[model samples]
Target: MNPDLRRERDSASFNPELLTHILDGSPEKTRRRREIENMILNDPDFQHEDLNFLTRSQRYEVAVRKSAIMVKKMREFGIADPDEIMWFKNFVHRGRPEPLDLHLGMFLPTLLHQATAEQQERFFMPAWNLEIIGTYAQTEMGHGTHLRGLETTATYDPETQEFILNSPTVTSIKWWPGGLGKTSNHAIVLAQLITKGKCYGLHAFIVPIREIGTHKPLPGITVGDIGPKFGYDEIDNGYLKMDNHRIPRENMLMKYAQVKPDGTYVKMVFVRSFLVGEAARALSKACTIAIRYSAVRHQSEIKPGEPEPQILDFQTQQYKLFPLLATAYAFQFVGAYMKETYHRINLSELPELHALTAGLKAFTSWTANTGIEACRMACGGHGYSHCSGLPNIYVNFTPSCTFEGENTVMMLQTARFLMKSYDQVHSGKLVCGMVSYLNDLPSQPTMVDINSPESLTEAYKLRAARLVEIAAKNLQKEVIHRKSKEVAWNLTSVDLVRASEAHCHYVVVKLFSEKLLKIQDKAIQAVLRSLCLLYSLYGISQNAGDFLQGSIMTEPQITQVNQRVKELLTLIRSDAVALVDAFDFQDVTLGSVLGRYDGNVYENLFEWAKNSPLNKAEVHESYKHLKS
Candidate 1:
């Protein structure tokens, strides 16, 4: 609707519809995707006010209420598939996560994994149909990641034919569970299984915490909310401390000996996979807002007093936004591969794979977290407000960095994998995989063209190999002189984590290169190639030191990468709006006033502000004395 945005779109290098089909996977996908989106948009039950206007308690009430409505809504729609349920639920709730989403996302998926044949027959019928509402409770005040460290214990009593569940220490209190605060009546609690002092380490039990219909706390159970959080405001994030709560021995999940470790990995890996899409959606929204706003909002004149250019025309502005723009597209391809790879991985290289898995999860999450912030700031001042919709995106995503093995912990896991490869490659063993080249003589810098993506990706691979080598050498030195490998690992974490980060960087670029091969559109390929190069060149520019240390790029070569990056900025500048548009999020689902489909941001923002509860009355309560 804005003249500047129109001009920008008109000047786009390629057709958006052509790109949109590929982004959506095909023409039919776009059709069905829109069909699904419109169904939610039109549904009165899903239409919601900004949760920011309500008190935290009120938001929780709304969340529970809305969650109930959606459960029935899903039943009526006959959408039973997990993916469809998620798509339907996400399309409806948009940005704010609710208790029920957690129920489905983590609790239900995990329960299905651990629950037995009869348990599934009895439980899943009600659980899926909404007769039962439950949650997963594993994290405690003292322990989240460590399985052996969990202190909750369930003791079997033969006479009673029951298991006594108790949270023995203050630190052992079940904490940070969704739906446990005030809503869910049941939880799958993780505890130690104790049978006559022969402890079977962490196991899952279906413990009823509240009376089913009355929704009252059960005897010997203490439960309440964790109060407000940085985001996910509507969620309860509750706590539970129990003293000798009893459940039938049948309630103890038997296969948990096998399920315990695998389930944790699955649930957390699921969280990471979900985060990939979540982060992509968030950055997509942020970029759409910032990019669209940048096109419309003009400021200082580029040519003295002639005419103010659209802010996106500024190279520095493009510098901040375009690479991130590339990343959003990059994530979509990698995101597809992750789910495929997860199932593929479970059934070859379990330890090294875990290490590699840690890198993908941690790095994608960290990249998206940072990218969301970059887009928000690129929009300048208005992006600071909740109405801009960036704050919601920022807050919801920030937690991802902390949870799901914490990025650093996961990165250290990856570093462990790298160090192993370094040791083995030196051992002259034939290791066949992505990191197999470690044993081969490391390649020296090549005077290659930046436009050739093969050399560019090799540049990425080269830097990663060099970093792994360097970190391993440092660790070896520290261990030989100072302490054991254990002591040395703690001290060299800085280098170790950096090496992991470098390797993940290589993974992203490598996936991105593979993604480019599938495209048949020559024109679309050119545009994407420029964006891909932008991402790679931008990465090289940022971490020029790694390239320098590895002799991957000389001083002048580094300057060439920088210069090519600026040139890519120009190549991507005109198509920036088009690129974001290809993400294809419905304007309603996007939930950003700054990034509306029509490009009428100022009007919508003012309207959004004027409708605030503070604007309800002509005279304020604070000015009552003057009025009197």
Candidate 2:
């Protein structure tokens, strides 16, 4: 390691290991996680070389082989928890999405959550045991976010005791399901249900698209890989179309929505909830690479006749990196809190939970996506190269902005909820948790302190409330003038999205502040307080106009907040490396030359370049076509 980087770690205010334990939830969990990671890291079968230089086909093939081996090894070792399987895959595959990704990510989850008990025995067990492969087929070429607009249909035929599935138009073909192309024989397809001449809304059905033994497309089914993408090459994101496929009546996921033999339709309501963990993982990777490389890299000196200081010592670099470092921790804590909240709260409270997850997912993902790019740009030219590993991380994480839900659409969803909740508060109904402040909006303007958590949180609450009120009023005015709620909503969408962003920021700050008060360790508590202050102030600095609106914060306060952000950056700079180190990602999991624990970036970059396929030949074939 670089001497300066070593010094930074040694000088950290808090013990890195203790913080790691806190981040992992407990010391025992940390120890067991390390044990699981070591099982894969120490095995020769899990190793791969020159992965970045391979072709898409080669990479996909290797991922499938590795995935199968991983499953076998996992079973042999008695590691049965699905979470452990996912973590093990993450460590061994290094950021590559495995072929069975959707099988575990969406397919099995659907089976467990939506399938009947008899259906579970037939489908879920086989999937859990790896007896078959499956994927979730939604997102048609013409429609992604608008699930109700899907054109694929499953019509009940009582005489035959089956459902005929058809993608009636070219646009209705399933376009972006992972593992749908060549790997999986089955899919949980989302399509409109028609029974007894009545067309119901979308429902899921277990459709067998390929023969189990041969893995060949079944009759009336057309499926193949969708070709190259910007990232996720190892995943066979694919396309599928059906002419007139048929499946047994029992294949419908009938736990929630059902079609009877007599053609009766039954439906039930459902709700959804985050990529916070993934965002944290991506942000940590970016920080790991940028911070470590910045520590080892030296450039121009601050004064004459002196050695160049590490790039991390420069304020401009610190300004670009430290907020994101704090953000990663902020998100880590929020993600944990969200998970625990889900487990602790009853199902009756899911709508609030859904709104919370939606807003946080949109906020955290968009921040991490841009933050990763900022980390790359902060490293200068080297950051652009694949050898630095930033490019891979950036490409892999960029899709997160659109997947699960598009960030803008998700923000709108949260906005819809906020507007309704605000209306509820106005009607004298009590609001609780996260938005409880809606019932107690501050009516008097007071001098807001830039440093106090309580004051900053109050400012956030007021700002969020103002944004939501403005959006709701604007929407109501449009409805009166336009005579159409749909048209009015479309016109007010820009403000609605802004309102969602503001609300989400408030929740994050509030949660981080509340979490800080519960920490028992003084050293950890003190450091986290600095981070919470930075997060709150940095948010205000970014949206100064929003804070200044209605004098929620004065222009002078906003300026002071900017200055305080810079000061916090300075306060947190010495611990930047240590904060990321506490995330506890293994070297293999990071898979970056610039992010290695040893800090040997330049040497590793050179060695990695030498192993590229282009460098394998003494003379290139292109040489013959050249003038030389």
Candidate 3:
């Protein structure tokens, strides 16, 4: 066995069988994930090298070559048949998986939505295979969040049957696209489509970035990496300058929106909100990693005479970690449902799904990003280092808040959906879809006994629902009282945003409670119930006023909750490592020195640090100030 894998197997404290059970999947499913990852890590055919030393062009070249290896590994892992390849590609750290996503996630999904069946049959296979590597080159230097302001234009020519793409300014260059720096030969570039005298909004088009064999930039294409960044150093975030580049008229990703020879335009899909939903999936996965890590890591004691405390043992830590854990599970379930609903909608027009997707994407990404930071802080100093594994995770994960759709912009989309829903319910029309809780406001309960698990779960859901209702009413009042829609929106946006957040929070808590019902193992269920209680109670304590407004607890009951939470922390402290082990992160994959569960942390960490390049040579500077 390789040293890393050997160390991982030796150090893991939890049984693989137990992990498979906890994950509630078939053993084959668990083994498949582990075996595929292990093969990739152990493959002698694939190069295992770091990109930190590589120059820009070298990095790009290396990424492209390895992508072929990645594609092969995916198929060998049964990824193609099981629909696991995309997630597998996402795990490889050669850099950000943006190029892989461009083809599989964005480009193909767009094509599936927009293209005719013939178009899909002709293009999807080449794109799916490693034959044509692609990137989504959408955001420009001038416009990152506001898609409407994109400066590049794709003006069509009826006679020539082509579209001329132009970047009018340096800022109009396609910037921040992964793989565009060197890997991808093709891109699904978003550009303003112009045909008659009028300019339509942003549309996707297939653009060839490099010549097939020579791997040289095509004429009128200027592409390169965007130097270094704060975290995603491995990612080939790039820039593209299109100086009157031209492509066949059919290059437009005409899956949903189309332009005819007569210069008329039509749209098969009206809402452009699905892009935001794609982002939510990324954020949800990030939350899972962060939450599981926090539950496992041990720290200073919360009670006297204990050997040590799990970071999760402190109420402060619980306040930070458990709610986030709850959110991760919540978002996971929600994201799964959203993906299914989105696919169903793609088959047919569904206005409700579009709005829910936009709202949920915004709500979940912000929660995940914010929660990961809290998890990082909960781990204290180790979380700040790359070795603890949190820093690297954050680097790759934090970008979702900004890219695809900015969190603030996404929240406004949610705000739009909430305000519309609020108006519907107020007019006595039923509010449907995910936000239906808004329509059924439970009268403030005279008393709530949160000591019982069932009561606590119901109280949390009801309190969360009430908070959303309050926020919605506040927003409605502001909108009516103020004359200008923009001014009123700005005035009421805080409440609207808060309402969206609360509604989403309730959905997650309800999901967690529902998940608890399906587990049959008594011991596992007991532990999970405590975690669920911790998750809900912590969120309730943090947002006490939101709960207090509905009288879910009296002042004395509030004190009791705070004290009971500390007691529960002590109760769960012994199970900390076990809880984290349940996440089933192989030690090789965790990449954390301090997190090893075999009590061999110091020895492994010291050895790992010694492998750093700086530790290679002990003596003497090559350049001496004075000639020796």
Residue-pair clashes per candidate: 0, 0, 4
On lDDT, who's better, 2 or 3?
A: 2
Task: Mark the 10 consecutive residues where model 3 has the least summed lDDT.
Answer: 268-277
Model 3 steric clash pairs = 114-254, 114-255, 114-256, 115-255
Model 1: lDDT of residue 162: 78
Q: What lDDT tens digits, residue by residue, belong to model 2 across residues 1-628?
A: 7687788889999887888888778888788788889988889888776678889998999898888888789889998765576667788788777898788777888788887888878887788876679998988999888888999999999999899999999999999999999889999999999899989878888998888788889999999998899999888999999898989999998876678788888760011233777887799789988998898889999988999989988999988998888788888888777767765774547778778878888898999999999998988998887877888888888888888888898888888888888888888788887778778854313778877888888889889989888998899999999999999999999999999998988888888888888888898888888999988888888889888888888878887898888899889888888888888877667767888777878888898888888899989998898885
* Candidate 2 ranges beyond 4 A from true positions: 81-83, 112-125, 257-274, 346-348, 442-445
Q: What is the per-residue lDDT of model 3 for residues 237-284, given as tens digits with 9 covering 90 to 100?
A: 889999999898778877567888776888712122433333333333
Give the alpha carbon lDDT tens digit for every residue of 248-298 in model 1.
876877763432321221115656666666666677778887888788777
Best by TM-score: 2
Residue 44 lDDT in candidate 3: 68
Which pairs clash in model 1? none
Cα error, candidate 3, residue 309 (Å): 8.0
How does each model score on lDDT?
Answer: 0.80, 0.85, 0.64
Q: TM-score for each prediction?
A: 0.93, 0.95, 0.83
